[model samples]
Target: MLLLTNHIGYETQGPKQAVLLCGQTQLMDDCVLLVCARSHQTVAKLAIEWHGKVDNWHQGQFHRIDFSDFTTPGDYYLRLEHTHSATFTIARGVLMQRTFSDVLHYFKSQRCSGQFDQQDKQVPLLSTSTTADVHGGWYDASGDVSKYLSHLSYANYLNPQQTPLVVWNMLKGLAVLQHHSGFASFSRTRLKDEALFGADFLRRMQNSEGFFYMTVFDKWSKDTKQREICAYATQQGHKSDDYQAGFRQGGGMAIAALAAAARLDTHGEFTQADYLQAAENGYWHLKEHNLAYLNDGVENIIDEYCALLACCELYRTTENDQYLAQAREWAQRLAKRQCSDEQIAHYWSATSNGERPYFHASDAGLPVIALCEYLNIETDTANYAQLQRVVEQACQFELAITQQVSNPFGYPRQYVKGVESAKRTSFFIAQDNESGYWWQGENARLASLASMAYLAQPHLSTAIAKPLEQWSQNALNWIVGLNPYNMCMLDGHGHNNPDYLPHLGFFNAKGGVCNGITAGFDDPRDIAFNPAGQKDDMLQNWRWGEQWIPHGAWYLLAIISQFAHF
Candidate 1:
């Protein structure tokens, strides 16, 4: 079908002065459009392609009206097939510049255009743009790595899950500090026991049914000012939004680890039931949300694994085996999602709206580390061997992967998987599948460090070779050495840009890079640090800047600690 129509034409310079030949509306592939450009050749080429008839037509179909051909800038005409077309008058005038306020006004009007009527209830702010405005922060970017170091203290018995390992290591390291450093004595006297393990903190919070305010710790973030704004007035409350799954999972791990450790000490306080209840509540909380986070939606694997690890820990204490069964169930699920050897879905890459690839390190690495711990802990030799194979496969995938980007030197590719669908791009084969991977962001680096650290002492808990451990340890140390801070800069504004490079991949205090006003374009999503945050409002404010994400370090430590004891 073909038809010609006239439309008002304006110049690029101004609203009224410029006038050009108004070409009648031409229907192409289910749409109509009027366009102008610098190159006539390019325009004609694009037009035919837009119509999807370029193959049929050897020559492009375009009307070229050069400026020299016309003396005046007014009415112009294009003759269509069999002499059918529309005319438009081009005008010449001055253009005006718009201020941010002007743009905001226009944006608001369009935002309220009833297009989002169905989303009114779910929409927290007036516009999606406003809703995205948030501040990120952390507390103690390098909050005493004593705990993490202690996990490494384990010799030849690393746990598959590192939660216990991390907690144990911290206790050991802290004890060393208490014995050697004057700072410890001063802190103990002044703060009156400020030195609490991440697990201990979680247990306390769980005991109170989520009493920690998200704002209480925002000042500890990399961008304390920004996080404060978003968490306090701009977005959701902390307890309901920030820590939903993470706190529960990590806390559960910590509690479970503490309980396990307590068995060794006659003065032990944390009961197995207390820790188990916390873990149970945390798992149920995650289940209630269908595993979809408040702001980040999906793209989260650490939390899922944290929950799985917590379950596994509970199983260890209760010897119920159901926990172990559920743990394996999730591990297999994650394994199947991995991108294959040909990079063909090695059971890791996660599909994210079919845009990016499954390139998350944590999704790929955390599971492997946790699985190793799980396999080593299983007394059932056959089950241990079975779980070991899967974990090894996952570890191989992690070791063989790399992030892909539009440009070589662009932002480091981050891992993302959507909740709606489960297909993603393959990091290796470059295949279009639902695979998952890791980014070079803080979370990845920290997770890599934890995993690598776990791999370093493979012989400590499991029978993995020493050469592998040495290689893993060296690689991990290299990652830790890459960033001077050994963590993300707790206070850097420039980190907000897409081009911003993170100082380290530690869990809590690392600040993420964002090109625009929001944390997108450059970064996939901020790491969830505080688990005590409000789950209802995920976007308001998030704690991405801290010493370490509770799950990332705590889980690793937990596994390492538990295995070391054995």
Candidate 2:
């Protein structure tokens, strides 16, 4: 008798599914895979493709079965004699629509007050009455708490307006659902409202000079315990006019976001001219101040790419040669700083003179996206070839990590150089020296870049693209429930999904995605905030469980890539 060791997306499905089985040598070619419905009745017998022994290095060899003929949308399970695989769904249309609604609902639930929702309550702020604009942005995380402009700005930058492929794909699915159901849906309207809420918030935050106020700090009053909002430069109960201008990366991203929205806005919520002028003004604000990095010592290459994105968007909207030239300059500058290595692939994480570990997904992924954007307009073959090489190296690096290190079920390590493993643990959870570097959001960023690269062209060689595509799918599947942890990173999406997170108020929110599983349990923060305590334990930990907005954005992008077909 053979046992079922693991499976992928036990609750999610598509037209095809891969199931892996372990225990005793069995006839890989002579297994009958049966699909059964809720009534415990056999619905269909699927043709299985034998995948041989799972790997070469293991003791008890494992085998794989590929089930490719799911014909309907409903709950079902597989049966191989007596061993039943975990219950899964074949509702491609239903799953897509539900996820789309759940993601947009999460964003709406995070929206600032002056908005109404049944499940979400607005915490009235004194600043709401005093300031000209009291409510507009989104909560930066699971909590019904502080709204960081820097975080929201990037979320706006990556929204449907900028990455329409994902949004359009979902819309097509919605169309199919509507056609089959024979009814119009209100989801399309709600999706637009959610988008406008974030965009309008950013527009309101922009000062006449084009600089946006930095992080907004919130507090619970000792006397009243009511939530209140304040800027970084202000004190408790002291409403000051002072606000730190957002750092370069977020500011530049906001510029690009507004520029894109300006081109796409049809309802006149904010005019194209208004957005363009603000972007130009914001660019000059960064120029005059010379704020290239975070005030804290840690610097990254994100601002460079953000600048490139803004330049490209502005040029595209206004057809201004100045913006186009700026885009070219930023692209060239970034290309010169790009780096490569053996185990770790291509990266644009540091400046020409500086060196730092390139682990952050946005830092690594955005360069490829930015390069693709530039390639849309530029005709320089030499530079195009150079861009192609950069993308190839990035893809190759990710593929190597996925193929060699993350086998059966895992993701590419952000830092490959100084990884350590616990000596006395069942699972080999990696230990990294720098805790801040071990962000779970990094995976989402890498997945987003991979999907974008897969779509972009001056295409990759089929030899290269095939592995890259597989690795991309594997990484995304791991997030959804293809790992040893057996936990879906997104909240309330599947059975055994994460229930506890470090989010302040809304840890209970059903659909918000959390920061993914992390290997770094050595940090003081990890040691203190550890969830399910055991060495080599990452499935439950604060570092691994913290749910944030940017991570949610990346998660949505990853899902879109996986299920969204066009």
Candidate 3:
């Protein structure tokens, strides 16, 4: 059975596809027939656009069967030669309903309330012994129960927003769901409740001094007694007492989430004023002391993009010229981070100097997302045009690289300048650099890029937007089960999901998403960790099986971006 597709399904209006040929084999000039599953009749026949042996990735041909134009709203299966692909659904709003509850369920289950929320009830701030009620965020990941916003702060560039990113995801996702006419009242209601919980968590995480504490770590032991407020330990157990949150680490995203929530329907224990004040305070604090919080003296692209989003959100919420001006400035800075050299490729450098390529295991699409969001409120014509150009350049770079070395499922790729001298397109996060042996599957990266595509569409013409729309859906389709492994990374929804997911407590849980396929240990092109026989390092299973919060956060945002007309 060479035919591979999203076993979970696709939406009627959304892009639909299946790979007829890929890795380990190749058959040129093939035709695939799409048949209605129920009627058992031919619906559409399409020619497969097969590219011979696409690069070193598994040494296989890329065959694309795009059935997007066939949007009749029915169950269908693709047949090429004697092979019949798995049956999948195709209905209006199919994906939205299919993934919405499951993704939201993952967030709901990861929530910290009850005992877990109070884990940091009286934790002392590292710099000062004064206590802060730093509690009520979701658990960070499956293997580790600790909460974090700056787990990789010391690594600077790779410092992902953990708890704070989740908070932002909730509020932003909630905003999208509220405007969607396709979903039930239940979905928005659930999203609003979770958003409020996250909003409160951000409130508690902030300080009168302006910065947010980076993490509340208990050494991954789940013992409340050991929990301490600080910038989280490195993934490899390096400790730090410098607890202030940098833009990427958590502060900017945290501020962004708070401001977003403040403008929308938030009330009760955490007032709108309270959320706005916290965002403004934290924003101002970072402006004064951001340099002090950075591990490296230099601010990288991560900081600029996160700050861009934070400032943009604040400006939208308050109509403040200061933040609007600041947003434009960050957008300009982000543009400078792009390496315009066609020889080196149009990738963003870690910093403005173009010294190292910016590759993220998470949030690969943040730069484009930040830029697109800024375009919404960019009033000045000059600022709008400049920001628009950057967004186009960034999206084009993403589309070009992804299509350059086309894969069966159109899996997103990153530009890496690793320890090796070779600067090439990569399917996985490079082994070298900041994380220091903590690379996982990039579902978050795919979702991040997909969200960027959907958001950047209105700012783009139909020519670029068409491919982007398909590419965006392709990324989402892969996550739900349309890849080499036939594994649906998201739990409980698709036909075949990960049963071996190293979840916090229950693997049977709904909506929990595992860290997905990574570059095989032996080869970068080969997708590894099949979740079938790779039981060697049971402890190291977090690489491909742990259900991390960022995965769900980004997935939720990606799906919401498509449904969020407002």
Candidate 4:
């Protein structure tokens, strides 16, 4: 028996089509797609043909069904070959609102169970004042038990090799929340409280000298199976010498988050002035040492972008000339690293020596997002022109990368980068299934960031804006079940969406978006638990299908922008 599978909801006006599939039967030519309203009245009917085989594993035929004409903005369900789907909505803001709520609620689910006393129950501050009992923030992911300040900024994916937090990830999420101020009053209130949850934890990590703590916890103590909060200097297990004195990366990222929160202080829950002061103090730490952040012994470009973004946010928050000067200085440094090729223009090299030009989404897209912020604030005409040029260039780079490497459904391949690979090279093995791995959530993350680039340049000519908008929308569509698999990447939403995710919490339930979808073999034996012969609910066998906070945050930002009609 075959079934109809589609997203839980669809937009009312634009791009209203959904991809349907037959799971266990052959397409016997001449299939009918029927859309019915809440009253069980047939509103629309379409004859769909066999698009193609979705993939090798599914052994199913793809049928893309169009119900764009049924735009009455009401509840609806799909019927095909005596198979009926769950009811869904056709409202404008429904999916976006639902996803935004789900992502915000996911943070609560990940909150530590340790007790603390505070006026607001939502703010998970340490009751003991210091780090006596481990409290607050989120568990990294999957079976891992450690909770570190750095993990909040990046996805640990329950992997030890990628240790510590990337502060920019948290800062970026904060910025996204602030940008989407159009949320309903209740949602806006919840968002602000959640922002404070992360902000409160970040504030606690700061020292009197204004230097932020780089790493809160190295790993859970194997003996006790618990993490204790202490200054990086006093942490027991892993050597914390490098992390003790805050580096420019963490300090700058902290400043960025604090400054963004200060800018969004419409309500007096906390003092925005104090946040600004803290940011100023932290910025001085970055000025003092000026160290490069290296990941896996390689210099990371994201560190520089974080610092630059911090300066830009400070400049926007306070009209201070000093912050503006600092921003220009950092922007100049980045401009020099911009790729010379116009086709891949503004794509900064990840390496210090200018060897590796391509970068991971966090490394590449953060700079684009930062530059967009800088463009929004700069007053000088000459500076604005230069920043605008870079913004457009970054968009072009994004379009080129996504267009060249994306699958037929318009999802970018993160592994595709560099001149050698740009000509269409595949991922090599021993690079850990380099060719077969797909980070679907990460692709959604990148799409979210790139969409911001389009929003930043609203003055772009229609000829330019139209294509960029199409590409960005395509990426968003792919994330929510417009892909070849006909399955929503988010968990607990669409029909046949992930029922199991590889996270410490909610592995048995529906909620929280999974890490991503993959095309081939998964590795690192512990994380890659995908079982053979599994069609749906691939979380156990696929590490890529694992869930992460950063991925959810990024996806939320993208949809929020869409809901606001951006």
Candidate 5:
């Protein structure tokens, strides 16, 4: 049988091409062809047959290969690793056919022969969390908070909040993340449900002194130092002094995610005021900063992500025309602030002048996904339809080429038509410039893939499986490739060779056979917050790269929550 093997997703140095099968003869046309390259171009073709004989087909700047002469159709392999066994009967023309008649007889014979192939078998993903975990990547939360939220520096780091362009996208994304946790998962742990957590966080956030922490606690004692630290760290406990100050561009994004979560989980406990106040507070804070003219209208990706999200929710909850207006403005800003790559938007600075303007993957994906979501939820069919078309087309235009494969630094194609550089450097704008790189790595990939697969499809809950199933497979591939040994690095954590990157967490993939639970603790966060220091294989605390890796687990939680219900 002619078996086909194909690789998917925005991964570099990954197995991007497929190895085709050719049965008997080891010549062109008689052999199965292996196609590799960014687009329709075939990079390499080889003839595979018995007697350990293989022939090279083609190689060049734009590689193309043809294995038309090879005439085998029995059992074959790819890259000497993957194997396929099947029956094939080739006609004079090269079209091969094989039939299994008498289904009952075939089944009986299959059982008798006991032949089964694990590689081609499809296993139903039994658990919602299970899908995200299958990929196996190192997850960190606390350090991520420090990097993304509190202590970071950039032109658009969190500035340009008034744009409203960025706010609404984040708002819709929050809504999407909160809603997707499957009905079953939420039912089991209503209080622990991340959606509930997000809602509660937002609801409480309206108060200037309210404490909001993704990692929650049972009780707080003022005298306890740890409790005091927790309190100070939370949104409420912290000084409104900082947010109250001129403006914290970073807080703007947080408010957007929190507010959208509040709107979605309005189970009688939350009111419009909670979400509205958060949205307004964020806006007030951004306006106070007055970044528009001074900053030349550059806003960080998170700022846009958060503001768009918050505004979308505000529009939904409060029916505010102004929120819609704000969203439109940011969309315009994004279109206007096109980067060297027409596909990608820079947050503040231009790529040519040493500015990595936008978030690598997430900056592009969030707005695209948000546009689809905002439109899906909006009753205004005309505006919804219009925005939907633009967002989808825009995202496709940007991601189409890079989606096939990326470079070591995860850089996609150089640029689109309008954004292409006059003299493109060997190191693409996103990768080598170093200033602008992987802020939103896997999260961006998950968001884009989810949007492309699930959006616009009927949300019949049943249809949800189709898109989620596809995404689960791709996510799994990435996680497996990059976890334990090959990991998702933080902003400046460059990789020379992925094979060895200092495994601080002694635990390896083989040890992860147990469900993500152990004696006396539930989620890993539980372990993270528990009193007293305990030794474990998985890296924790400040010693072993925890802070450096940061937020991967949190983002994973966010991404997995999207498919929670479906």
Candidate 6:
């Protein structure tokens, strides 16, 4: 059987490739033919490579077929001897066109409009024993209805880029649509309205102190009295208001979104003037006292890259030279976070006692992405080529580690230094990665890397940039289909999608993605999808199945990479 994009399919201008994996089943023929769906006309012959052994962390012989050269706009399927694969579409703006309405519907449907949510206007803050007007943001996940700028403050370096990142990506996606002429006007108008909806919530979430309230929780209950601002409890005595958002925690992108909205949105619920001042106020507070707001009082690699975004965030908003200067400074700091020594695997340091690879389950590419964005507005007087060299070096390291093993599917792997512990390559993330019980399947991470590769292309030489384009394509391939499980992590898009109906829903949400495949809980070398089959009737499987906001945001940006010029 073939593993590929079976529903949404590939874009006509994008790479068209699929994987042929045989576990116990044998192929009927040595070669395969591609045929037009309606006319049944043979279009192209596919070449396959047979490797006897299975790829690492997976069992099965694997063969890959490349049809990137075939760019016909129509329905198509693969034929092997008498075997037929599922039909998929190929057209201009395929992904955004097919799923745009559903995906946009997801964000609109997720807006907090519950009766209890009204009390968020006067949120009780435990930090100062005071009340503040902090409300209006999308729910964090499919199963949970709480809002957060970001959580996991106790795991200082491992904090996921949450709601604020979603807001920033919405604005970025709007920019992508505006630049392209192929998309529909209706799609653009809907996206602009959805982005402004988020902008209004984000403005309300920012407190007068200039810090954003991190979460508005109701403890997964219907009791309105349970809703309050709180911190994540840990085995250690780290319990208090984790309410104040630091740069990496969510503050950076909150500031980034407000500033981005300040420029893009003219006549939304909040004026351009309001968003601009809110962003400026938020940035200044985090600049002076970000560490004081963190669980551990240290700024790590996450801060460096996110701080870079924050700088450029306002620079884009106000066109100020000082913000540009700060962005360049953080860009250099992010570069330095990389282990130039290279004694171990090349990854960034999260803290002082570490040569730790920056193995995040989300936003893994922020450092390089922020660097590329900085390079865009970088002055001619600046050392532009040097930073390009740094970007290339970072990508080369990623390429090296990804190919260091017999990694089939050509999917990007993380250079992890945990569990396997000799500083080796891993297909899935380590549970012990500093995020503190918060690791999921990294579809978000994969797409973020893909966007990073494509977004950084204009700033670098072809030699360094071209390989990453293929790398980015491979990431999108895995998300659609073409992986070990033959499972498309994106809901409602393929032959086999995850049935992760968390909270007793009828089915998974359309155009949303679940937290994808992960290493087995007990064994990092083993694989688990939705944490199942390996276990029976295991109810605690949100790690593999819950729909999250950041996944859609990153996926949309990756899809936009092909259509947008910048």
In TM-score terms, which candidate is top?
Answer: 3
Give the true-structure RMSD of model 5. Answer: 16.6
**Ranking of predictions according to TM-score:** 3, 6, 4, 2, 5, 1
- TM-score (C-alpha, index-matched) for candidate 5: 0.48
Task: Tell me the spans in candidate 6 whose CA falls farther than 4 Å from its real position.
Answer: 24-29, 52-59, 127-129, 234-239, 340-346, 352-354, 419-422, 502-507, 533-539
The root-mean-square deviation over C-alpha atoms between each candidate and the true structure, in angstroms, is 22.2, 7.4, 2.5, 6.7, 16.6, 2.7
Worst 10 residues of 6 by lDDT: 531-540
TM-score of each: 0.42, 0.72, 0.93, 0.74, 0.48, 0.92
Put down candidate 3 lDDT per residue, 1-566, tens digits, no spaces.
Answer: 46778866776777788875555344654678899899889999987876545445452455778888887877889876677888899876566667788777778877766666675778866667688887677888765657787677776778877777777877777665665667678777888788778888888888778898888877777776767787654555755688888887788899998899898664636999999999999998898889888988678888998899999999999997999889978888888888866554568888676767899877888888888889988878888887787778777887788777656578877788665456667878876666566678888888888888887888887778778888888888888887767677888866567654433463535787777888776666565765344644665666786778888888888878877522
Instruction: Report how far residue 136 has shifted in candidate 2, in Å.
Output: 0.9
lDDT of 2 by residue, 87-197 (tens): 666554343445656776777666655422211233332345543242556666553355554432221121111222222222323333433442235764664455545
lDDT of 2 at 414: 42
Error of 5 at 463 (Å): 19
Please estimate how well model 4 matches the true structure, expressed as its whole-model Cα lDDT: 0.52
Per-residue lDDT tens digits for candidate 1, residues 1-566, read: 22222122323221211111122223333222232322211112112112212111112221212222232344444333333223344443200011112211221222211222222212232212332211111121232111111111011011122333344333433432344333334432321122123334334433234211112223223332222212211122222234332322233344444434332222223454554565555555545553332233552344444455556656666677677777766556545444443333344433322233334322234556556546645677776666666665554433333223211111122333343444443221221122221112233333343444344344233443432332233222212221212221222211211222234433222222110111221222222222234222323222233223233333233223222322
lDDT of 3 at 71: 75
Candidate 5, residues 418-501, lDDT tens digits: the string is 122333321122222222221212333332344433443432235334434334223332322222122322222212112111
